[PDB]
């Protein structure tokens, strides 16, 4: 065990020195030639209102017209931002849902939370009434985040420090991802649906692979729990948001952080992180009851989204990229643009 | 209605129907007291949940409990009406750990507003212990000998003065936490609890109503 | 937990065995992606009022 500790320490030292050798300069030091993005002016075009409690998580649909919102009242409403009209008001047996996800085909919606179960409600039914297609279960902790690779697979974070790749048709963990020393707060799937990142309460983020079931790379640096995580649009890099009031951009290829979005004025934990269509910006909702629109390549407050009185719990850019949406604990979900 | 929007008219009908059910569920939601049971493993929340399983709800006002491992989720919700912290005062050594847990619960800034409906549970077994000679609080909490039974702390007729001494020692060791942090935004109401007691439920309801009144007294600044 | 610790250690070995790259090329690729889809991105520059369906 002691020899294991020594070899682990020295091996981590080789990893750090390899990264240092690869770390010639910071992103800002290299891209200072780039002109500033400008003033990103956004306003509440529409406000989806009608929930009864805190809106924990949202997931924009592939259509970019229909968006799920999970709410502590025990609801999953599918809203139509193009018409403001609700389409389904899926009730919940468990009031505590901290993850909701929309399938890329648009046929199913996943919800999960303290119930320790990932319930896959069915949207398109012959009768027209939503019912549980499959109650994936087997974890011993709350499912913090879950996303769909396709219409038949789902990667779910959980509170047992283990991510899972559930199969909808059968219901068993085809592959299990362990190694975090704390609750896995968030995860995101790459656009190619082959790699995916996950950030946990262990102050650590990983690049878990769905094929070989191994942590391909381990990225660290945050000084608190990583509540949010995303990808660059190309899928080659990603950004994390911590309770440390910092968003850090880590690149898969470079195996180290590229830029740290943080500032003295901004002191509050990030709750959700997302990019824009082209990846120039970085949209991060914070605990200051607001959202900050940074520039990804410069770490500057390009803009501020204000209008939520409570914390911005969930954030999401449309799949095509038309507009961004913020759902708060105010029991309302605004559609910024 | 005019019904002139085709597929959009169907969408309008669906949205109106969904809004109707949203209001219908708002009727229930705005009247339900939501409560959480931070009972320790040895505390004895099993007795309370068994009593609730017997029959929760009082009169026409609804109640909804949750029960429950590190708590990254306790701070996520602040809409809980109150906390129900069962404590097994029968076990003296585990009692100190329960007291520390109550410190953590009461000093959590996220739940700063939230009051706690504390239960000293399984106190009859505490009486059975203390009437015997084995149970000695002087070993675990030595300050028991330094304690005096308060005439203000009204006892129950036909009770051993040493039983009352011990029981009141447990409760005011817990209430040192509440009185020390006299924030006013949240008050602790202790209640002696025992197994096979159908009365426990009503206490909660009583206590629950009390907190609500104080909240109103806070909104209208009367208190 | 000696066996599990050694499994963790070999996982660290697997993480170390990867072939890394220099930051400069990664930043160049990020920069190229940012300006490659600048026109397509409708949040950097607000789209025409009629073009935006959220009006």
């Amino acid at each position: 065990l002691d020899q294991l500790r020594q070899e682990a320490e020295q091996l981590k030292n080789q990893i750090r020195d390899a990264r240092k050798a690869c770390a010639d300069a910071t992103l800002s030091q290299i891209t200072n030639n780039i002109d500033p993005v400008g003033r990103i002016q956004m306003r509440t075009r529409r406000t989806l209102r009608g929930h009864l409690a805190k809106i924990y998580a949202m997931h924009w649909g592939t259509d970019s017209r229909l968006l799920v919102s999970a709410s502590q009242d025990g609801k999953l409403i599918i809203w139509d931002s193009y018409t403001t009209n609700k389409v389904h008001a899926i009730p919940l047996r468990s009031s505590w849902v901290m993850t909701c996800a929309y399938a890329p085909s648009g046929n199913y919606v996943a919800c999960g939370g303290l119930d320790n179960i990932c319930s896959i409600y069915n949207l398109k039914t012959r009768e027209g009434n939503v019912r549980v297609s499959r109650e994936l279960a087997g974890h011993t902790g709350y499912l913090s985040c879950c996303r769909f690779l396709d219409d038949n697979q789902i990667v779910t974070s959980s509170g047992d420090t283990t991510c899972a790749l559930w199969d909808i048709e059968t219901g068993q963990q085809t592959t299990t991802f362990t190694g975090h020393t704390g609750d896995v707060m968030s995860l995101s799937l790459a656009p190619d649906t082959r790699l995916f990142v996950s950030g946990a309460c262990d102050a650590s983020a990983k690049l878990w692979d769905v094929r070989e079931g191994m942590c391909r790379q381990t990225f660290t640096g945050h000084e608190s729990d990583i509540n949010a995580i995303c990808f660059f649009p190309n899928g080659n890099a990603f950004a994390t948001g911590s309770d440390d009031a910092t968003c850090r951009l880590f690149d898969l290829r470079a195996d180290q952080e590229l830029m740290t979005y943080s500032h003295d004025n901004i002191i509050c934990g990030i709750t959700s992180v997302s990019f824009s269509k082209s990846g120039r910006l970085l949209l991060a909702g914070y605990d200051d009851f607001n959202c900050n629109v940074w520039d990804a390549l410069k770490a500057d407050r390009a803009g501020v989204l204000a209008g939520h009185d409570n914390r911005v719990s969930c954030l999401g850019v449309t799949d095509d990229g038309m507009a961004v949406a913020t759902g708060s604990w105010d029991s309302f979900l605004k559609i910024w643009n | 209605g005019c019904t002139l929007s085709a597929e959009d008219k169907a969408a309008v009908e669906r949205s109106k129907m969904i809004e109707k059910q949203l209001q219908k569920d708002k009727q229930v939601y705005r009247a339900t007291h939501r409560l959480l049971l931070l009972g320790a493993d040895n505390s004895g929340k099993s007795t309370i949940v068994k009593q609730m399983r017997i029959l929760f709800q009082v009169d026409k006002v609804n109640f909804h409990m949750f029960d429950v491992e590190r708590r990254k989720w306790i701070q996520c919700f602040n809409d809980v009406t109150a906390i129900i912290f069962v404590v097994d005062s029968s076990d003296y050594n585990r009692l100190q750990e329960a007291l520390n847990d109550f410190k953590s619960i009461w000093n959590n800034r996220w739940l700063r507003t939230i009051s706690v409906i504390l239960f000293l549970n399984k106190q009859d077994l505490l009486a059975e212990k203390v009437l015997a000679g084995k149970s000695k609080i002087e070993d675990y909490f030595p300050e028991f000998a330094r304690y005096t039974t308060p005439e203000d702390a009204t006892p129950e007729p036909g009770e051993d003065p040493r039983v009352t001494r011990a029981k009141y020692f447990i409760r005011d060791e817990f209430l040192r936490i509440s009185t020390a942090s006299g924030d006013g935004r949240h008050y602790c109401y202790p209640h002696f609890t025992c197994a096979v007691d159908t009365e426990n439920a009503r206490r909660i309801f009583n206590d629950c109503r009390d907190i609500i009144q104080r909240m109103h007294l806070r909104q209208y600044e009367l208190l | 937990s000696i066996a599990q610790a050694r499994k963790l250690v070999e996982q660290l070995k697997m993480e170390a065995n990867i072939d890394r790259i220099k930051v400069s090329k990664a930043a160049a690729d990020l920069m190229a992606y940012c300006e490659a889809h600048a026109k397509e991105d409708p949040l950097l520059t607000p789209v025409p009022a009629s073009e935006n369906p959220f009006r």
Side-chain angles (χ1 to χ4, degrees), chain A residues 50-59 66-70 72 74 76-79 86-103 108-113 117-121 123 130 132 146 148 333, chain B residues 18 22 25:
Chain A
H51 275 292
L52 302 190
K54 308 175 181 178
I55 297 169
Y56 272 112
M58 65 179 288
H59 199 288
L66 277 296
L67 73 165
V68 295
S69 85
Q72 175 53 223
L76 272 72
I77 309 177
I78 192 66
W79 297 83
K86 313 147 196 161
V87 192
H88 303 58
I90 310 163
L92 294 174
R93 326 175 183 185
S94 171
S95 174
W96 317 92
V97 293
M98 293 182 286
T99 174
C100 80
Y102 199 88
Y108 292 82
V109 60
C111 72
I117 297 169
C118 178
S119 57
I120 310 297
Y121 289 99
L123 289 174
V130 171
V132 170
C146 64
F148 279 81
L333 190 160
Chain B
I18 288 174
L22 282 178
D25 291 331

Side-chain angles (χ1 to χ4, degrees), chain A residues 53-70 72 74 76-114 116-121 123 125 128-130 132-134 136-139 141-149 151-161 163-166 168 170-182 184-201 203-213 215-243 245-254 257-258 260-276 278-279 281-303:
Chain A
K54 308 175 181 178
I55 297 169
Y56 272 112
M58 65 179 288
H59 199 288
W60 260 118
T62 300
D63 275 30
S64 86
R65 178 169 181 178
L66 277 296
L67 73 165
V68 295
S69 85
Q72 175 53 223
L76 272 72
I77 309 177
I78 192 66
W79 297 83
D80 182 312
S81 291
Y82 282 46
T83 68
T84 303
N85 296 115
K86 313 147 196 161
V87 192
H88 303 58
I90 310 163
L92 294 174
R93 326 175 183 185
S94 171
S95 174
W96 317 92
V97 293
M98 293 182 286
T99 174
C100 80
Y102 199 88
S105 65
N107 299 320
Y108 292 82
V109 60
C111 72
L114 282 293
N116 308 297
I117 297 169
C118 178
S119 57
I120 310 297
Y121 289 99
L123 289 174
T125 67
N129 296 357
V130 171
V132 170
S133 173
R134 174 82 58 241
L136 303 155
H139 286 282
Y142 61 96
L143 295 90
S144 70
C145 182
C146 64
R147 324 276 279 193
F148 279 81
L149 279 76
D151 208 4
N152 204 307
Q153 310 176 21
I154 173 165
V155 163
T156 62
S157 169
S158 294
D160 43 18
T161 62
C163 306
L165 167 71
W166 294 96
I168 301 299
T170 71
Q172 318 279 344
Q173 311 184 21
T174 74
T175 315
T176 307
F177 302 148
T178 80
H180 296 266
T181 68
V184 176
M185 300 294 326
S186 179
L187 61 83
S188 179
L189 307 169
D192 54 6
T193 73
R194 264 281 181 91
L195 271 43
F196 89 91
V197 297
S198 67
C201 289
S204 303
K206 299 194 187 306
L207 184 61
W208 287 104
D209 186 74
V210 301
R211 307 313 317 187
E212 183 178 2
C215 170
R216 198 70 52 200
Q217 313 170 30
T218 299
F219 300 166
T220 59
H222 272 308
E223 312 150 19
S224 190
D225 302 0
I226 322 170
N227 302 348
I229 195 164
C230 185
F231 286 100
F232 209 55
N234 61 1
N236 300 113
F238 71 111
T240 61
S242 178
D243 277 316
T246 61
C247 280
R248 304 177 198 276
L249 193 153
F250 304 100
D251 188 336
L252 280 68
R253 294 131 61 71
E257 58 186 11
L258 269 291
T260 298
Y261 318 91
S262 181
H263 185 255
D264 291 331
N265 193 322
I266 297 89
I267 45 162
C268 58
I270 297 89
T271 300
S272 292
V273 169
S274 286
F275 280 74
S276 301
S278 181
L281 294 174
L282 180 49
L283 305 174
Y286 284 53
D287 289 352
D288 60 352
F289 303 156
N290 273 14
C291 297
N292 300 265
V293 176
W294 302 61
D295 188 13
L297 299 183
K298 302 188 189 73
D300 213 358
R301 181 179 292 173

Side-chain angles (χ1 to χ4, degrees), chain B residues 114-123 125-128 130-135 137 139-142 144:
Chain B
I114 301 299
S115 294
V116 60
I117 300 169
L118 194 153
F119 281 171
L120 283 72
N121 197 15
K122 301 205 291 303
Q123 310 300 312
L125 271 163
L126 169 56
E128 317 287 343
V130 65
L131 61 83
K134 184 268 199 184
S135 66
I137 300 171
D139 302 1
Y140 295 154
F141 299 152
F144 175 48

Side-chain angles (χ1 to χ4, degrees), chain B residues 35-40 43-51 54-61 63-69 71-74 76-77 80-87 90-93 95-123 125-128 130-135 137 139-142 144-149:
Chain B
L35 293 173
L36 188 153
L37 183 63
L38 295 170
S43 49
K45 64 182 181 293
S46 67
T47 80
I48 306 313
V49 294
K50 170 259 184 176
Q51 193 276 341
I54 299 174
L55 265 178
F56 71 110
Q57 182 187 348
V58 176
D59 200 7
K60 313 284 293 314
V61 61
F63 293 87
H64 190 273
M65 266 195 257
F66 301 104
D67 196 9
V68 294
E69 166 67 22
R71 311 155 198 151
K72 187 54 183 177
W73 55 280
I74 195 172
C76 299
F77 53 72
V80 61
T81 309
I83 301 299
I84 297 169
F85 185 21
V86 187
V87 176
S90 281
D91 284 331
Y92 306 105
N93 208 356
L95 183 63
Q96 172 51 40
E97 211 67 19
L99 183 63
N100 293 116
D101 189 358
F102 185 63
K103 264 202 251 183
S104 163
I105 297 169
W106 187 260
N107 292 345
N108 181 11
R109 284 291 169 241
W110 293 60
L111 305 173
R112 213 198 47 67
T113 302
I114 301 299
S115 294
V116 60
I117 300 169
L118 194 153
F119 281 171
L120 283 72
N121 197 15
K122 301 205 291 303
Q123 310 300 312
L125 271 163
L126 169 56
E128 317 287 343
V130 65
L131 61 83
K134 184 268 199 184
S135 66
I137 300 171
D139 302 1
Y140 295 154
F141 299 152
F144 175 48
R146 308 269 78 173
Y147 186 74
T148 61
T149 181

